[PDB]
Amino acid sequence: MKGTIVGTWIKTLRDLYGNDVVDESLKSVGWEPDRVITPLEDIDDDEVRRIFAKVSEKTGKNVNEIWREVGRQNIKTFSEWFPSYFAGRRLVNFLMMMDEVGLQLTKMIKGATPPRLIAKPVAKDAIEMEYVSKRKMYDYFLGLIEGSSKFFKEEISVEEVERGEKDGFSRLKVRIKFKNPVFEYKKN
């Protein structure tokens, strides 16, 4: 990953799991517990992987479970660093815009590699959102969704539809139902 995102993860882990757990885990991979990560740095995905593995060991929580929790809380962290994205009224609009934001950053930020988050309405009160990535952060993705619902104070039901790997790409499709109708058939 790029530096920006790893910065948020470290912060979120600490908020979640305390300072000693994180300090220790970063040292285990040879990092400085209080490393200053710059946005445009490139960070070894395997190093991150080993960090989270250590957090798993120290806390006794399954790594997948940690990512789920990290995903939920990281929305709070990210909204504090980058408030403008969260400035809108609605959860649905937030979610529907995310794919565009991702495409744009791939273009703007050298080396940046965010997943596709393809969203499309499937009923008056529902969209499908498909995560597509070379990485595979199924639990993180799901966590982010819940965190978003939490931030926007809009209850949603999330049901997983498809999960699988093809051609080196991990995919996860969910159906997200909103409380009220948000879509309308309008003509082509």
Retrieve residue 14's tokens. Answer: 């600490």
State which residue, 24 or 121, has the beta carbon closest to ligand HEM: 121
Min CB(75)–ligand HEM separation in Å:
7
Alpha helices in the chain (DSSP H): 3-17, 19-28, 45-59, 63-81, 91-108, 138-152
For residue 26, the minimal CB distance to ligand HEM (Å) is: 18
Would you give the DSSP letter of residue 60? T
For residue 178 the two structure tokens come to: 């909103």
Cα 76 from Cα 3, distance rounded (Å)? 18
Instruction: State the residues that interact with ligand HEM by CB under 6 A.
Output: 1-2, 4-5, 78, 82, 85, 98, 101, 105, 112-115, 117, 133, 135, 137, 140-141, 144-145, 148
The sheet with strand 116-123 has its strands ordered as: 116-123, 126-133, 169-177, 157-166
Cα–chain-centroid distance for residue 114? 10
Q: Which residue lies nearer to ligand HEM by CB, 66 or 112?
A: 112
- Asked if residues 129 and 115 have their Cβ atoms less than 8 Å apart, the reply is no
As beta bridge partners, residue 165 has 170
Count the residues in the chain: 188
CB of 128 to ligand HEM, least distance (A): 13
CB of 179 to ligand HEM, least distance (A): 18
Of 2 and 68, which has the nearer Cβ to ligand HEM?
A: 2
Shortest approach of ligand HEM to residue 188 CB, angstroms?
28
Q: Tell the smallest beta-carbon distance from residue 64 to ligand HEM (Å).
A: 14
DSSP state of 2: B
| Residue nearer to ligand HEM on the CB measure, 28 or 106 | 106
Closer CB to ligand HEM, residue 26 or residue 129?
A: 129
- Is the Cβ of residue 15 or residue 24 nearer to ligand HEM in the bound state? 15
